[PDB]
Subunit: 266 residues, 6 copies
């Protein structure tokens, strides 16, 4: 079994770590893991901790369950329509920009804002038997006009993204795999174990490659922000060079740098 | 049965309305619903009427049939190669920018400019038995270098869009569904009824959500024009606020607006 | 003297043509040439006529004046706030519309050069109309540029602001909207949104002379260049427009005559040998 | 006199508030207001407080001074090279971080106008901080803009350079980085990256007056306009931010009250008739 | 049989031509067709020849085989990790910008830089039995942050592109077809013949259409460079007009051009 | 005096090198330095040599002169219209080519700074060559910038026009092409497409001094900064070029040595602990 260690106690979510993997999970299954403002604040807190922890290279975002009421399963049913407060867009940006791979692990309903959270994650694994993808934004006069819709079109195409939002129908794990927004359909009993196995495959890679590749694939859609993030990681690589040591040292010693000869390579 | 009411009489197309749905259909099945300049002018006229009619939230673009010659079915075979005149690009832009969902209903051949008309529609439903998607632009030294090709890549990907144009082969409804440019394969006998059912599901949604979501998904590809259209709808939402009432009233009364305290929320 | 001939009669604007130039001008100077819904409908009607007239290569967008009330000059002071309500400007048919945006797109996409001719105040939506025009000429003495959107809980978040940054840069575009200060013609020239500062008495004549210089150029070049400079900002729409003009050029070739002829004759086209040039 | 009240005490910066304006200023003038990791953490902390304070609509980012050592004035001379090492700047916790980029994004995304107030040298990373601010006011006598990145094998390849080209153009942005020369306040104004050249003794007061002009505007307009002018360059992130503010406007409508109420009551919403307006 | 004619002799590749088709193939099957710097230089040389040859409209990029060691098949295993030198990015740009259709023909392993070469080609045909797609960049602290990853997302979507790079797993021809980066799965014995048949279908099209369509589909992703290339081909079309003859002639004769009347069409 | 050494002999251009600078200059001043197909081939050949020479960090692109015929100075007057025909410029091999675009891309992508040095007329395609260079220095007395594309049914719809708008803004770029008027060096500086107005007798020496200032910088910084400022406009190609230089930096790390060594040795790489930094 996976030897999870609780990282912090929360009211609406769980947060655990094991061998380079952090798992953040919605923990209100009695109401199908809808988020209220308290939930979003805790999500931000846990994701920010994972962002700052250099031992963590992969974050799993999942849902606990099943519901004690009807035995049903949920990833996240979106905004608790009953309800500065940290909002879900700041959480989306933290997922997007952090130099860690974020995997949505979907055991059940992924609805509305819960659907858009799955979309912005780098990868999605979904329960064969119980994942249901559904967009209710247009039912309640809301809309995720950013990562939930326009970015959804970057994985399922523009026709299917429009269908998802305009009709608000349900889609199975297999249907979502066939359209391009689920990476793998996994038998429910194996979903969490398989998510951890995927995470460990990533954690065996070059961390520099993983960071640079995440940020390259963000860059094509994220404009100047994506450029800022990708270029910032490149600045980090330049800083490690002997050329950078000379640049800094010459500045500190108040002398002209000598960067060498025949350096204008191609 | 659907209780269609004829909206206007045309020579080359039909135009009818029912319960929030407008249907515009090519009506030259004897020549597989090719468009001539008269056809394009009528298309523009009917789409513009639907654009201006606040009762209409969904436009179906279809083809009448079958051919009296051979019993075959067509959506639209594109430009009548026999032939300011309103051209098909102005029709494409009207489909693209109107705050209504436009559904291509494809009962048969969708060829050349007819193919590109299906592509720019927000959704496509296609006849299982009789829809055939085919791009003939490269056969006749033409090209739709905008919504027909580059935008096709935003729903089927860049490899498949290139194949469609470079080889000009035929694709079935099922093949087109699997590549991402058809939303649903529908038995021919149910195609028109199912299109109307899809339309009624959309018409039950929030019209503000539908407009904003269409324009958000346009925005990612349509650059400054997409920004103009999306921001224009946001300006409309701002105008409804009490803050806007005060802005207008203060201007008219030649006094400084009082927008209140602690308004710089996040 | 320019031999203008009135093209159509309107309530809120004037529309005249001469030797390849159309002039559309706001004609409600007593209220500083604000546009009400009727004005916007008439603007669309005149611009679309110019778009469809193949003798017209340049459209001047100007303002008549001065005010008979107080002697002030205006290009356009933006939306008439007396018509503003819920969801937009309320027309005589009851609709709440924001269709100056449709006028903006007509200006943007038409294969003709549109020159804003600014004899006075250019405020709010009137400022944004100047911005979306291809060129702007401004009265030295009396043109004043001012963005009031943020005063009245409005915003042009498209061609009025983001596109403004493509001619004056992002710092200056932000300044114009966030503070809503006045800028003279010379300041507007120095920041990059005015092409030429002209003495007021010469402004209309100079706009006509600019138009005649454009009309002496290759119309294909002018179309393709306008659409190329649109393309870098207009995304897929800009691509549709620019590629569409390219398709028009391909249609003229002997290669396309063969493609169409082979299709009509049910035979395989013969496009020749060694055609894969670079 | 401005009645500033200290909001929080910091080691390397000052943070004060008055009547809707927050002022964050570098306060290590003896080393020309360079930032070390502690400075960057404190900048983030103060900017995030301003972001969360709904009374604050404008943030001034300035520099204290002059140096008591040599009398020189600085806005910010960039990263403290004594803290620079492998992989970035080394903090007291041992981490090698480049988190001025997180500060840059906080400035960029916050629904408040951030004005760089430049009383002296703005060098390197300090130059790039001025660039990402919404507006810049500069000391006529003493502001000097200089990019040293290429001298020390560094580069700001995002908001410091590519975004600089969105206010001064691509030729001038390339010049600033490739040669690393000095530019006065007036040169910086003429190229488009400084909004106003101000006498040094009036710089801080004028920045406050600019802030008060913004604070008299519609806050919805200011937010939507900042995010519209961000959107044209910030791609999907800019779309997320701008659309998110639009979603906030939709939430306020009676239409959204019906959507939410129908959902909570397990009934079909009734959004009315003839709603498909244009 | 296809009557190939050897175009030039090389050490690490083969280069042949037949009836408008050029074929460039990796020819180091004993090491699974990895490229060393010599290989990349030869690739550039052969592609540049094909670019300059007006008889050539389609280039096939393939791999020779099988390995004499184990009978295995390879397209290209990427960089020979053993190893101005022409590098693979200049080859990618030559493939991208040349006014010819480039088809990746994948008979076996397509790994690392070999995978990214398949991605940038306009079309990909793959061996049903033996093609294996695998991204090893993250195993060796490398990354193709351009056409290999961000452009891969333009054909398989952002979720699947991230999976390919972050986990570095193997994918079959059929799996690659289902995600969108392979145009057709072909029985191994028919792969090369089918690639030539595809090429001949392209070569029967309008060369102007093919060029303009390739460059239109590049334009949506290639920014100002894509604009330069697409507009350059449009300049070529303008030069052919009688209007251009008058423009040139008036310049040479030092007189005002007369471009005619009523030319401002729409 | 600069100790130039001729690098290669050409018919239509000169090509010399000194201390890290290459100078490529048009050398047909009797026809105002127009380029024929042979010129374009030679330009490509010289630029590619400079690209491959690791001692060369800066390339000056200039014009020789004056004309011995009429004493006039030219940078480059664009395509030689005597060679223009169907489908492009006709070379000695019979091909109709537009391969100044290949030269434009070589300038754009090479990891060296290219400075246009403009001693005289810069017209048409010669104007567009100046635009795509990273920097432009211009003769105060004699540089004249003029776009004739629209006079001859041509257009540079890429780096010549859309990219021009990224340094002078969209209104001015439209003016330059639609009217085809002359602009002095000072006007070109004021609009943002010229970096420095230089006395004619000092122009070449000042270009060399600018080059030496760049050559004293970090070559990695200069490469990464050029490619970062390209990236914001060059889309996926710009991303390919910038990311490719980043891959080169990763290759140098001890982490990459381990990745490659583990691969060659058929073992799992050990990239260390706590590596997921931020």
């Amino acid at each position: 079994m996976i030897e999870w260690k609780t990282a912090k106690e929360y009211e609406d979510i769980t947060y655990k770590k094991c061998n380079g993997v952090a798992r953040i999970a919605f923990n209100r299954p009695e109401i199908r893991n809808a988020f209220r403002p308290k939930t979003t604040s805790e999500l931000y807190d846990a994701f920010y901790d994972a962002y700052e922890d250099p031992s963590i290279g992969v974050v799993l975002l999942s849902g606990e369950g099943p519901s004690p009421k009807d035995g049903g399963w949920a990833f996240c049913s979106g905004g608790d329509q009953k309800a500065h407060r940290l909002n879900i867009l700041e959480v989306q940006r933290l997922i997007r920009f952090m130099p860690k791979v974020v995997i949505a692990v979907v055991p059940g309903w992924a609805v509305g804002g819960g659907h858009s959270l799955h979309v912005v994650c780098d990868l999605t694994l979904a329960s064969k038997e119980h994942a249901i993808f559904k967009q209710t934004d247009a039912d309640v006069t809301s809309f995720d006009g950013g990562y939930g819709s326009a970015y959804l079109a970057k994985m399922v195409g523009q026709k299917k993204a429009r269908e998802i939002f305009f009709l608000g129908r349900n889609y199975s794990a297999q249907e979502a795999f066939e359209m391009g927004m689920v990476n793998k359909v996994v038998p429910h009993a194996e979903l969490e174990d398989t998510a951890y196995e995927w995470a460990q495959e990533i954690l065996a890679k070059s961390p520099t490659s993983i960071r640079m590749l995440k940020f390259a694939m963000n860059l094509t859609d994220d404009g100047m922000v994506g450029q800022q993030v990708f270029a910032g990681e490149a600045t980090r690589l330049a800083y490690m060079t002997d050329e950078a040591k000379e640049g800094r040292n010459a500045f500190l010693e108040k002398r002209k740098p000598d960067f060498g000869e025949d350096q204008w390579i191609s």
